[PDB]
Design a protein around this motif. Structure first.
Motif, PDB file in Angstrom:
ATOM      1  N   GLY A 100      90.431  42.188  37.534  1.00 44.60           N
ATOM      2  CA  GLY A 100      91.526  43.109  37.750  1.00 44.60           C
ATOM      3  C   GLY A 100      92.283  43.243  36.437  1.00 44.60           C
ATOM      4  O   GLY A 100      92.928  44.268  36.203  1.00 44.60           O
ATOM      5  N   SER A 101      92.194  42.230  35.575  1.00 44.15           N
ATOM      6  CA  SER A 101      92.877  42.296  34.291  1.00 44.15           C
ATOM      7  C   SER A 101      92.343  43.473  33.468  1.00 44.15           C
ATOM      8  O   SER A 101      93.126  44.183  32.847  1.00 44.15           O
ATOM      9  N   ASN A 175     103.107  37.475  41.969  1.00 44.79           N
ATOM     10  CA  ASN A 175     102.852  36.308  41.121  1.00 44.79           C
ATOM     11  C   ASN A 175     103.932  36.604  40.087  1.00 44.79           C
ATOM     12  O   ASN A 175     103.850  37.621  39.395  1.00 44.79           O
ATOM     13  N   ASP A 203      99.549  46.508  42.023  1.00 44.48           N
ATOM     14  CA  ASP A 203      98.662  45.360  41.844  1.00 44.48           C
ATOM     15  C   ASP A 203      98.647  44.570  43.159  1.00 44.48           C
ATOM     16  O   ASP A 203      99.526  43.740  43.436  1.00 44.48           O
ATOM     17  N   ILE A 205      96.074  42.416  44.247  1.00 43.38           N
ATOM     18  CA  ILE A 205      95.051  41.344  44.310  1.00 43.38           C
ATOM     19  C   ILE A 205      95.357  40.212  45.299  1.00 43.38           C
ATOM     20  O   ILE A 205      94.448  39.466  45.655  1.00 43.38           O
ATOM     21  N   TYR A 206      96.613  40.027  45.717  1.00 42.41           N
ATOM     22  CA  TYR A 206      96.907  38.943  46.668  1.00 42.41           C
ATOM     23  C   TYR A 206      96.998  39.417  48.111  1.00 42.41           C
ATOM     24  O   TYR A 206      97.451  38.655  48.985  1.00 42.41           O
ATOM     25  N   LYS A 234      91.070  36.385  43.607  1.00 43.79           N
ATOM     26  CA  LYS A 234      91.959  35.543  44.407  1.00 43.79           C
ATOM     27  C   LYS A 234      91.535  35.420  45.880  1.00 43.79           C
ATOM     28  O   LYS A 234      91.546  34.321  46.443  1.00 43.79           O
ATOM     29  N   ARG A 242      84.638  37.470  37.189  1.00 42.07           N
ATOM     30  CA  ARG A 242      85.180  38.631  36.490  1.00 42.07           C
ATOM     31  C   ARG A 242      84.811  40.000  37.086  1.00 42.07           C
ATOM     32  O   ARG A 242      84.159  40.818  36.428  1.00 42.07           O
TER      33      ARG A 242
ATOM     34  N   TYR B  64      87.888  30.326  35.942  1.00 42.28           N
ATOM     35  CA  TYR B  64      88.250  30.936  34.657  1.00 42.28           C
ATOM     36  C   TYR B  64      87.839  30.071  33.461  1.00 42.28           C
ATOM     37  O   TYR B  64      88.074  28.866  33.445  1.00 42.28           O
TER      38      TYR B  64
HETATM   39  C1  LIG Z   1      94.675  37.242  39.205  1.00 37.16           C
HETATM   40  C2  LIG Z   1      95.620  38.415  39.019  1.00 37.16           C
HETATM   41  C3  LIG Z   1      95.138  39.656  38.561  1.00 37.16           C
HETATM   42  C4  LIG Z   1      93.681  39.921  38.201  1.00 37.16           C
HETATM   43  O1  LIG Z   1      92.862  38.795  37.935  1.00 37.16           O
HETATM   44  P1  LIG Z   1      91.362  38.895  37.473  1.00 37.16           P
HETATM   45  O2  LIG Z   1      91.010  37.380  37.381  1.00 37.16           O
HETATM   46  O3  LIG Z   1      91.391  39.459  36.113  1.00 37.16           O
HETATM   47  O4  LIG Z   1      90.616  39.622  38.512  1.00 37.16           O
HETATM   48  C5  LIG Z   1      95.985  40.695  38.405  1.00 37.16           C
HETATM   49  N1  LIG Z   1      97.298  40.543  38.684  1.00 37.16           N
HETATM   50  C6  LIG Z   1      97.815  39.348  39.119  1.00 37.16           C
HETATM   51  C7  LIG Z   1      99.323  39.271  39.407  1.00 37.16           C
HETATM   52  C8  LIG Z   1      96.983  38.266  39.288  1.00 37.16           C
HETATM   53  O5  LIG Z   1      97.489  37.080  39.717  1.00 37.16           O
END
Ligand SMILES: *Cc1c(COP(=O)(O)O)cnc(C)c1O
Ligand SMILES: *Cc1c(COP(=O)(O)O)cnc(C)c1O
Lengths: 382, 382
Positions: A100-101, A175, A203, A205-206, A234, A242, B64
């Motif tokens: 997601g990064s 987060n 965002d 992801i959670y 997550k 990745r 990671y």
């Molecule tokens: C983990 C996370 C992401 C994306 O993580 P990837 O390991 O790159 O998939 C994006 N935003 C937040 C707030 C995260 O905790």
């Protein structure tokens, strides 16, 4: 001439790194440390996904994939966003990325011209201002308050909108706060984007790590203004694989795929096939998510009770696997607080880099056994 | 406001994409096409590498990894660069990336400010100019000649240097010409970088796909001016795995790792462990390289014989798995020639995007049977 670019020299230095180094000497001198620093699940990736990787290997799926991702995964993604999030997207409005990064990085590279402003809500995930600045953008911070449960006040956000605002980044479940934003607040933010004509970057992801409330996707109401970022990391304990994914307006997704073409080409082929299984075998993925969710809830309740018994303050979180704890009773600031706790045998993340001053992020993606020890040691420090 | 960034709107179109369109429509309307378009080995990745991947999966290596890559791999990389290339590097002057393409992308982001010039030698790999302009660079092109075996003339290069030159990109063995540059030309090029103070980027991914001569790494004559880019993609039929690597000055490597941390985080952990195997199991890895090299050489000779017999002109390649064919006898230009060939039943890549006008890139990373089928169909366009 030799010498680095300005964009790369403009990168700010993390407090986390520096506390982490001291954590490593302590360990070298044999010091037992309890780590509450994890930004990833403690569980291993579910077997149905591992097995799909094994089949892809044996089937020789080891060649280059299209920049936006294998077509079958893009179709499955269109299904997931509609079915789970109520988003009306087609397979072409979907993209697979290297975590997601990378979806976030490509997005900013694709929508920001130097000087374009992006409103970020603090406390924020460390990477947001970084990615915004690296693309030549200007970060405009709007703070959320502990007394308001770290939920944004649309009124404070309106004040940060200017004619240069390109985007607003929203992260729920959050987060590092653990806050889950009510649907009314998210609808309010989506309305600002529509009224002021800017992109809403959500965002999510959670989404699956939720204990109470409902996960609302703002793309439900403003699909042409919203870029939804998500991933397998997550939810399915696939951080090291990745694989991330996003959906949004066709033209922005196409641009994002262009950036991938000129950088990573495409995410790892074996990981894309494994993710396809996570998305299509809903029964086995659902079982994994429910198991993790129950484990996390128990751990969270265990932690919060303990902190409260110690007289330590933390806003109760509704999602993700983090707790932001006020450090005022331990030291004058959060780095001094983190160094003291290190001496007590507990590794925590200082809130500095997230703009959560006077707080420390605790992560409960560990065993109950470890959460008990950590509480024993906080006790000693008090 | 909403809308795309200039850097993303700036990318121009591809002639490849347009002919692949026509090729897809014919694949569609019942046509049999032999494809000589491949930029990847036809071989599957070797079993020992696949077996290393299964082991990491079984071991839970799904978390990671650090931004520059797992420590075990950086060390193995140092051994590879010291042993195979005569480069003197420490694991710290070593970086793992998502394909060699990301190494190059991160490199330009780390060293180029808007306006900085980068010298590229045409015919060139399509991504070089894309990557340079995306970071704000100016592409300065220096042509290599068919008459000269597509080997650069240092003097022509010298004539291109300005006070704005930040780097010079050299790719040997070359994609798309197949040329392998002599040690003496590589040294002359390194010298200019040292003499005029700029970076020398050496793309050595095809080092093991060499049929005659010897691979020379110019980082040996200008260690502090050279960034050596490589990867497992072409040598170990691991294109879909997305694992590349580079070495060079510590401060540049460290800057490239920072770009990764803010974009992809780190390459896939499973792929990193599988690559460690490709690097340390020299006996199985050499058996594969040697088996592939033999096969490529057979296919090259067969293709060259066949062309010659048809009266078609091409410069004889010494490395990689490409041949640049002169299209003069076929059509006024290379796009037209590629369209005629499509009608004749053969898919090839127009030389247009590589600045190889009047040529078409043929790839011999396919079976001899397919090469024979193609030569047969070539009779139709004379
Ligand atoms: C983990 C996370 C992401 C994306 O993580 P990837 O390991 O790159 O998939 C994006 N935003 C937040 C707030 C995260 O905790
Ligand atoms: C294939 C290739 C690369 C790198 O490929 P990755 O798949 O990204 O490892 C770099 N340069 C050239 C000339 C190539 O052909």
């Amino acid at each position: 001439m030799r010498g680095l670019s300005r964009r790369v020299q403009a990168m700010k230095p993390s407090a986390t790194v520096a506390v982490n180094a001291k954590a490593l000497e302590l360990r070298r001198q044999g010091v037992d440390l309890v780590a509450l620093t994890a930004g990833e699940p403690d569980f291993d990736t579910p077997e149905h996904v591992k097995e799909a990787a094994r089949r892809a290997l044996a089937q020789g799926k080891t060649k280059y994939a299209p920049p936006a991702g294998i077509p079958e995964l893009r179709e499955a993604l269109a299904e997931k966003f509609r079915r789970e999030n109520g988003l009306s997207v087609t397979p072409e409005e979907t993209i697979v990325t290297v975590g997601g990064s990378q979806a976030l990085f490509n997005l900013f590279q694709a929508i920001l011209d130097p000087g374009d402003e992006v409103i970020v809500l603090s406390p924020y995930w460390v990477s947001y201002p970084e990615m915004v600045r690296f693309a030549g953008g200007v970060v405009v911070e709007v703070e959320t308050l502990p007394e308001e449960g770290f939920v944004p006040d649309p009124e404070r956000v309106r004040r940060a909108i200017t004619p240069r605002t390109k985007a607003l980044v929203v992260n729920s479940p959050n987060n590092p706060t653990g806050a889950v934003y009510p649907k009314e607040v998210l609808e309010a933010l989506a309305r600002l984007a529509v009224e002021h004509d800017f992109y809403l970057v959500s965002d999510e992801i959670y989404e699956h790590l939720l204990y109470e409330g409902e996960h609302f996707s703002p793309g439900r109401v403003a699909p042409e203004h919203t870029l939804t970022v998500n991933g397998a990391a997550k939810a399915f304990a696939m951080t090291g694989w990745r694989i991330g994914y996003a959906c949004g307006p066709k033209e922005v997704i196409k641009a994002m795929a262009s950036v991938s073409r000129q950088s990573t080409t495409s995410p790892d082929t074996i990981a894309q096939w494994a993710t396809l299984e996570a998305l299509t075998n809903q029964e086995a993925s659902r079982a994994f998510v429910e198991m993790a969710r129950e484990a996390y809830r128990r751990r969270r309740d265990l932690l919060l009770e303990g902190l409260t018994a110690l007289g330590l303050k933390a806003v109760r979180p509704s999602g993700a696997f983090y707790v932001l704890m006020d450090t005022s009773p331990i030291a004058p600031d959060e780095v001094r607080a983190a160094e003291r706790l290190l001496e007590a045998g507990v590794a925590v993340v200082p809130g500095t880099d997230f703009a959560a001053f006077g707080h420390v992020r605790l992560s409960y993606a560990t065993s109950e056994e470890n959460l008990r020890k950590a509480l024993e040691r906080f006790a000693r420090v008090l």
